[PDB]
TrEMBL record:
This is Cytochrome c. It comes from Geobacter sulfurreducens (strain ATCC 51573 / DSM 12127 / PCA). Residues 14-79, 96-157 form the Cytochrome c7-like domain. Heme c 3 binds at residues 18, 29, 32-33. Heme c 4 binds at residues 21, 56, 59-60. Heme c 2 binds at residues 10, 99, 110, 113-114. Heme c 7 binds at residues 102, 136, 139-140. Heme c 6 binds at residues 44-45, 47, 74, 77-78. Heme c 5 binds at residues 21, 56, 59-60, 76. The lineage of its organism: Bacteria, Pseudomonadati, Thermodesulfobacteriota, Desulfuromonadia, Geobacterales. Coiled coil: none annotated.
Length: 159
């Protein structure tokens, strides 16, 4: 009712709850209204934007409330990681990214990717660009993880 849902394409929504913030600021709506949240035609701020001080990040910095830049504090807002993301493109079977595989493999880290503009800042990145270190390529280069230059079947289906 007073809980606002922030829907995400590949994960459960993050739910902003007024109750706990009101008990915190003593119903002073002025703290967050028409200053922090214009709530008129907002974009979908990214976590990096929040790290810059936008959205929830205007407070969740570590000083006032837990920071949005803490791998151990993501659970404070997000329930989990996400559901398996399926990538579609012409020329190969669906490429699938799973967290069940990766997170437990990176000691539970999250910002390694989510706060890495070279790993998340793209849209329909190609294998060429992955080779130059973009997206999956930032780690699948035979140093960190198996190279993206080959191993097609390890990521793509029907291969
Ligand atoms: C052998 C070297 C491979 C072939 C042939 C292809 N891949 Fe990949 N791949 C993966 C993902 C998650 C994506 C999508 C990323 C995004 O869209 O942002 C891709 C994309 C492609 C594409 C489309 C772009 C292009 O034409 O270059 C094709 C046709 C494609 N891939 C063919 C993931 C991975 C990966 C996991 C680390 C590996 C090893 C490969 N891809 C290997 C090949
Ligand atoms: C790189 C190896 C990653 C690590 C480590 C973590 N995540 Fe992840 N996550 C990654 C990808 C490839 C994707 C899809 C990217 C996209 O275009 O959306 C995701 C997705 C999520 C999401 C969904 C975001 C959305 O739907 O808008 C969330 C909420 C998310 N990831 C959270 C998350 C957490 C909490 C992690 C630590 C336990 C974590 N991810 C690690 C890549 C990577
Ligand atoms: C910061 C901690 C907040 C305080 C204090 C209050 N509100 Fe708020 N409100 C806040 C956010 C992050 C949002 C989500 C806006 C968005 O961009 O999606 C909201 C939303 C509302 C709404 C709209 C509800 C909806 O349509 O989902 C209303 C009607 C609203 N807020 C009222 C309200 C009142 C009256 C407050 C004091 C009693 C108040 N808010 C405080 C953030 C915060
Ligand atoms: C509550 C203060 C949050 C904490 C702490 C974390 N996230 Fe978050 N995340 C939150 C919201 C409200 C939203 C949507 C904001 C909007 O305007 O739409 C999100 C969104 C993300 C996304 C998608 C966008 C992006 O940056 O890629 C992801 C992938 C996500 N959040 C991941 C994430 C991680 C890994 C966190 C820990 C470092 C993290 N979030 C903490 C609110 C909050
Ligand atoms: C400052 C003006 C705030 C803004 C903007 C947002 N939050 Fe916040 N949050 C703030 C404080 C000072 C606290 C209180 C202390 C506590 O630990 O409870 C919080 C707390 C939360 C919590 C924790 C709730 C709990 O059960 O303890 C969550 C999950 C949270 N905040 C989420 C959240 C989101 C998603 C916001 C942006 C959409 C957001 N907060 C903004 C102060 C402020
Ligand atoms: C570094 C943070 C990574 C990024 C970015 C992505 N992956 Fe990854 N991947 C990484 C590691 C550490 C490992 C371990 C490899 C090993 O065997 O030592 C992996 C593993 C995978 C796998 C193998 C899964 C399994 O067989 O259980 C796949 C299929 C895979 N990774 C796919 C993948 C895709 C599609 C990515 C981009 C969206 C991606 N990974 C990013 C580290 C990292």
């Amino acid at each position: 009712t007073k809980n606002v849902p922030f829907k995400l394409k590949n994960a459960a929504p993050v739910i902003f709850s007024h109750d706990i913030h009101l008990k915190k600021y003593n119903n002073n709506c002025r703290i967050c209204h028409i200053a922090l949240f214009d709530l008129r035609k907002p974009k979908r701020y990214t976590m990096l934007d929040m790290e810059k001080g936008k959205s929830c990040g205007a407070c969740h910095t570590g000083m006032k409330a837990f920071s949005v830049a803490d791998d151990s504090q993501c659970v404070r807002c997000h329930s989990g990681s996400a559901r398996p993301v399926a990538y579609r493109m012409k020329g190969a079977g669906e490429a699938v990214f799973s967290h069940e595989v990766h997170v437990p493999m990176l000691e539970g880290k999250c910002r390694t990717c989510h706060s890495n503009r070279e790993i998340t800042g793209g849209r329909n990145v190609t294998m060429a660009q992955m080779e130059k270190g973009k997206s999956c390529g930032a780690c699948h280069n035979d140093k960190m993880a198996f190279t993206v230059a080959g191993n097609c079947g390890k990521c793509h289906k029907g291969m």
